[PDB]
Design a protein around this nucleic acid. Structure first.
Length: 48
DNA sequence: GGCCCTCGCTGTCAAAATTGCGGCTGGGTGTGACGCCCCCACCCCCTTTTATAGCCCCCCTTC
């Protein structure tokens, strides 16, 4: 697709059924500089 | 004093059972939630009356 040259090997290509899973990167990304702390431990809380 | 045996006691090794402890790292959703029996104060209803009226039980009457 970039240079327009033929690929020397011959790619195996065809229609295949794919599924998108609920495991999505926007539901998983998580960061924390400084936030709320626990009532008992005074340590950072559990989970995003 | 010295040789030889059986015996009782504390003791020991061994077998057997009894018991405190452990069981990966981390992450993301969601969902939901005492009683028994007695004793002691205090209050309500028992009764009388009446006005008042809607409601309802009881007995009578109809066919």
């Amino acid at each position: 697709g970039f240079t327009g040259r033929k690929i020397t090997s011959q790619i195996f290509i065809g229609p295949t059924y794919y599924q998108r899973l609920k495991h999505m990167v926007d539901d998983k990304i998580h960061s924390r500089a400084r936030g709320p702390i626990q009532i008992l431990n005074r340590q950072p809380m559990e989970g995003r």
